[PDB]
């Protein structure tokens, strides 16, 4: 919508209702009259609207009260408390913006952030804007973490992050209004060519996609209704459920065949009993035909009572011949049915290898959106975040998405080439042990009051751990680490010197010959200035394709392009880059995914900080020291870049929740 309600929709907040977070901070307003609640909703959403109108400067709080409801002076400094509440938790004044009021020259508190990714950069600048000392420890020689961009001359290609999922409600729209981001829309037209290189007709492509959507509707009702979630004392995946359903449709075809032959043996037996009655009646008619001829040899007036006996046998014969004529009519009706339904049985409608190849492509596309095979996704919670999708079309970054983390790193104190070894947290402070990537013997020690960990979950699940925690994490925390998984996908950059595809088509698909290799080079992309194609590898083959050299992968990419457009129409590429996120020791995979046996509660458990025990026996409850962030710590928006962006804003908002005013002192 527009106005106050439109600003609430843009900030993921209900326009006519208060969230649970707004109830815990102001319990007096939500438990009071309804009119006071509406005033709080209006003040919040109006300041949201003022921020969304001008996100490039600091939305102050004195001009907000001055430009709200004429001279508005009927509140005892209530706008101050509400504005400071909203600006801290990242609901209003979200992202990184130029601040009018200067930062405090003396900072309060020291925080070490592990990893300079989107989450590590957002929470850092928020920590710094709040008046705290920040130092980022990055093991890579750059920032962004899982945000990679290949830049060489005029070729731009993103090896990890570039496309978004819309601007409606997404804080990325404000980031695009803040950081110079050229956004280009994605044309959803994606033609499909088989292994031979020829395209798929419209009627065939629409029927396989419709059957693919029908199998996803089977997925929905197997999950939310049949509760098919326990099999052999183990959680049920999805690839098994879909394959069973498909085999049941082949059973439905066989049953339709059997029932069709059952209806034929049924009518054929009716013809059997009908013909047997016709034979028996023909013999009786033949007998009566022999009888009355002897009665005709005598004159009718000669003997007596012949007119009764002759017409009686004549009427009975006439009645039986009339029935035989109607049974002959039914015989003709059954014969024309045995000529109409003989060569047209309603059968022979499976899925075949024709539709299976395209169905394997759709499965690979679904495996790409999750970076894991369908046999690892939980049937119950694989689309648990499917209700929080963003509105609008899908857009890309025309000039590489790395322009965001490089711009967010402006003014921060980031330690590049610094890998963290141990993480010590006690009741009086924290100590981070880190080394230099150029020489592992050089060790660095940083003191701080709190530590924010943005490391991927796949690193913590692997034993031995690459980063040790002292004291070790509790069993419930490590169990949530091991239950969840970490997906994998890769990209292959193909830099050419001339356009040799269809410029108006941004992406085209290539189906696989087999099911095991369905996620092997199934989709290429065109959406940058230079003629560049972006191949996609996913599934179980993705991990195997990483063990293969770059020349073979590019040779397979060229062989597919030559098989579709021709050998002469396909020149040789100039630069080729292949990504290996699983082989990357600083990622150990691609991005998060709901595994079988896990749920959305595990994302919230990753969001919960840990509190170390007291150093002195008998000391009170210490202050929570170690907090985590990243894409795998947010429940509603996992596996995205704004999810990690909101995680940094979340921990930024939890600063005041940790401080909780100055009431506990007196």
């Amino acid at each position: 919508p527009s106005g106050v309600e439109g600003a609430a929709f843009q900030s993921r907040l209900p326009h006519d209702r208060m969230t649970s977070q707004e109830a815990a901070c102001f319990p007096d307003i939500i438990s009071g009259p309804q009119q006071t609640q509406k005033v709080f909703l209006f003040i919040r959403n109006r300041t949201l609207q003022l921020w969304l109108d001008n996100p490039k400067i600091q939305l102050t709080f004195e001009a907000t009260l001055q430009q709200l409801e004429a001279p508005y002076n009927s509140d005892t400094v209530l706008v101050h408390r509400v504005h400071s509440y909203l600006e801290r938790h990242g609901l209003i004044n979200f992202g990184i913006y130029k601040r009018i009021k200067p930062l405090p020259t003396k900072k309060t508190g020291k925080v070490i952030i592990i990893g300079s990714g989107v989450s590590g950069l957002a929470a850092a600048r928020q920590l710094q804007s709040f008046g705290m000392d920040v130092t980022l420890l990055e093991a890579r020689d750059r920032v962004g973490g899982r945000v990679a961009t290949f830049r060489k001359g005029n070729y731009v290609a993103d090896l990890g992050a570039m496309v978004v999922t819309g601007l409606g409600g997404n804080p990325m729209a404000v980031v695009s209004k803040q950081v110079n981001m050229e956004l280009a829309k994605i044309k959803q037209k994606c033609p499909l060519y088989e292994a031979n290189g020829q395209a798929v007709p419209k009627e065939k492509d629409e029927m396989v996609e419709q059957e693919f959507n029908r199998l996803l509707e089977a997925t929905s009702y197997l999950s939310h209704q049949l509760d098919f979630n326990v099999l052999n004392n183990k959680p049920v995946s999805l690839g098994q459920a879909l394959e069973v359903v498909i085999q049941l449709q082949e059973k439905h075809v066989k049953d339709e065949q059997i029932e069709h032959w059952k209806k034929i043996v049924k009518t054929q037996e009716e013809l059997k009993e009908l013909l047997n009655k016709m034979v028996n009646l023909k013999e009786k008619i033949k007998e009566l035909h022999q009888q009355y001829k002897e009665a005709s040899e005598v004159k009718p007036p000669r003997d007596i009572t012949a007119e009764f006996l002759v017409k009686s046998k004549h009427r009975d014969l006439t009645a039986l011949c009339k029935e035989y004529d109607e049974l002959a009519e039914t015989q003709g009706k059954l014969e024309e049915k045995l000529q109409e339904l003989e060569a047209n049985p309603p059968s022979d409608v499976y899925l075949s290898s024709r539709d299976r190849q395209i169905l394997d492509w759709h499965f690979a596309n679904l495996e790409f959106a999750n970076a894991t095979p369908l046999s690892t996704l939980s049937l119950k919670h694989w689309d648990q975040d499917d209700d929080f999708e963003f509105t609008g079309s899908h857009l890309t970054v025309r000039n590489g998405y790395s322009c965001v983390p490089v711009a967010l790193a402006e003014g921060l104190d980031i330690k590049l080439n610094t890998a963290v070894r141990q993480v010590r947290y006690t009741a009086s402070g924290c100590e981070v042990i880190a080394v230099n990537t150029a020489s592992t013997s050089q060790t660095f020690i940083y003191k701080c009051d709190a530590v924010l960990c943005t490391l991927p979950l796949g690193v913590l699940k692997q034993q031995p751990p690459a980063v040790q925690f002292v004291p070790p994490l509790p069993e419930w925390k490590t169990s949530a680490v091991q239950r969840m998984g970490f997906g994998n996908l890769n990209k292959v950059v193909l830099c050419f010197d001339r356009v040799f595809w269809d410029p108006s088509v941004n992406l085209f698909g290539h189906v696989g010959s087999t099911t095991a290799s369905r996620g092997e080079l199934f989709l290429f992309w065109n959406l940058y200035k230079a003629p560049i194609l972006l191949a996609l590898v996913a599934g179980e083959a993705a991990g195997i394709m990483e063990a293969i050299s770059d020349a073979v992968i590019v040779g397979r990419c060229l062989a597919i392009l030559k098989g579709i457009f021709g050998s002469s129409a396909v020149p040789q590429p100039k630069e080729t880059v292949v990504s290996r996120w699983r082989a990357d020791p600083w990622a150990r995979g691609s991005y998060s995914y709901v595994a079988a046996g896990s749920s959305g509660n595990d994302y919230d458990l990753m969001a919960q900080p840990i509190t170390p025990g007291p150093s002195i026996p008998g000391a009170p409850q210490p202050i929570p020291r170690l907090f985590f962030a990243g894409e795998h710590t947010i429940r509603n928006y996992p596996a995205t870049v704004h999810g990690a962006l909101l995680s940094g804003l979340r921990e930024a908002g939890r600063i005041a929740d940790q401080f909780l005013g100055a009431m506990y002192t007196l």
Partner: protein, 110 residues
């Protein structure tokens, strides 16, 4: 959620009875009982009026009035039976004065 090309369509999901009921139930109630339906005192005064026009200064035995009431109600109930049959014969359900007049015409009561 990371579906940017050909998204997965699936995976998203006072009381008043009707006229005629009390009447029929009242019919059943009176067809089971045999109590007199016209009240005794207004009927007794009506008969006294009718008798005054025949002979003056007359006294009635209480049993004489009850016998007059018995024959009168039986005549009227039987007449309404014939009256209801006439109304149903005319493709109607409602009795009308033409039905009683037709019934008394067939009976020969002129």
């Amino acid at each position: 959620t990371m579906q940017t090309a050909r998204k997965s369509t699936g995976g998203k999901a006072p009381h008043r009875y009707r006229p005629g009921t009390v009447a029929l139930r009242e019919i059943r109630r009176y067809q089971k009982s045999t109590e007199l339906l016209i009240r005794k005192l207004p009927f007794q005064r009506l008969v006294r009026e009718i008798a005054q026009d025949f002979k003056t200064d007359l006294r009635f035995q209480s049993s004489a009035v009850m016998a007059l009431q018995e024959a009168s109600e039986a005549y009227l109930v039987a007449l309404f039976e014939d009256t209801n049959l006439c109304a149903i014969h005319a493709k109607r359900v409602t009795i009308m004065p033409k039905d009683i007049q037709l019934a008394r015409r067939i009976r020969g009561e002129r």
